[PDB]
Homo-oligomer: A and B are copies of this chain.
Amino acid sequence: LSNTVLPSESMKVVAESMGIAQIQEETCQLLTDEVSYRIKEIAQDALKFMHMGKRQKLTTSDIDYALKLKNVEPLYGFHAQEFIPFRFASGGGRELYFYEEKEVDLSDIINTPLPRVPLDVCLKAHWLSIEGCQPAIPENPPPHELSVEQQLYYKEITEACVGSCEAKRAEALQSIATDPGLYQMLPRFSTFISEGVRVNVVQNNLALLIYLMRMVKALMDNPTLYLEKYVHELIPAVMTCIVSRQLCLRPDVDNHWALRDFAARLVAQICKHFSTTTNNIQSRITKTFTKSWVDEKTPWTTRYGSIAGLAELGHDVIKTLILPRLQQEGERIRSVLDGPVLSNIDRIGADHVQSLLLKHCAPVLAKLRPPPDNQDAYRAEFGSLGPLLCSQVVKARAQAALQ
């Protein structure tokens, strides 16, 4: 960024090797911008012998070729095999570094073992590429912690539920559902499932999400392991499979709809088995579903997920949550019976929402109405929910006849 020079306090030290007692700070600044200017002119001319003589190393014979170029006398004794040693001297207030040179008896250089004789430069030919890729000749480049038992069991069970074949998956899920000692591997499975449902945002894979939801459904059926301590991780994973909007890679043909009602049945089971008044699981799940449904701007997929979960919770929930907003069906049929914009995806999701709504509101209409139901459909929104309610009353009569 800036012009970097040798420090001005390094020239007071040098001036006292000379014998100059007091040197003023404007003289020391005058010395160090000249000697750091001549260092940069031999740093960059040594680099011209490193580049033209192709070396990329900057040996000490490059600087000696550049001092020879600037007419300045050479520096003797820098071609021997040495390195960078420095020796700290603490002292009583004078901090410095020196060399600590060593000695050697003269007869131990006359009687040193001689190195081996060098070889002369010769040539060698070899193919580098033969009409294509390189040959494989040797002149070329070559190209708390789970025990091992349960580590292997975790590896095999998790890789059996990634989708190589269906039979190994069914045996892995029947292992997870029916083994007695799978504790100490429950936190690993919860982490695997929650992170795998998170990895849907990078790759919208419907199939791997169906596999992870069948992994959760198999974990719930195990009688021996208690998921009370780990349910705070599995609740938002199933919630993500319910109320997210893109569950598909190709939105139009992928049946994200089933991973919706499967995960809705799953979360109704997870708040039937685990909701306690200290937990407030079910009230906090209904509140998220409710403020996702009543709030406008929500896509038809996430509204489908909200209605699916709320309708799998039970009968009184659809009495006191779904039935006030039945007028919203009119806002739905605004975009179904009517509209030039027909070739969008907002029609298949809307009539899926419609079909789920009238399927779940038909027994609720069968519970809280008269037995006749003559023009209840006309009194209902769009006159279709009422036809579905008549069909539901007929189905109930058929069930009574079967009984």
Contacts and interface: CB of A to CB of B under 8 A. Distances in A.
Interface of A: 187, 190, 276-278
Of the candidates A190, A276, A278, the one having the most CB atoms from chain B within 10 angstroms of its own CB is A278
Nearest to A278: B187
Contacts of A278: 187
4 contacts: A187-B276, A187-B277, A187-B278, A190-B277
Nearest to A187: B277
Contacts of A277: 187, 190
Nearest to A276: B187
Contacts of A276: 187
Contacts of A190: 277
Contacts of A187: 276-278
Nearest to A190: B277
Nearest to A186: B277
Which 4 A-B pairs have CB atoms at the shortest separation, nearest pair first?
Answer: A187-B277, A187-B278, A190-B277, A187-B276
A283 to B, nearest CB: 14
Nearest to A184: B278
A193 to B, nearest CB: 13
A278 to B, nearest CB: 6
Nearest to A188: B278
A228 to B, nearest CB: 15
A279 to B, nearest CB: 10
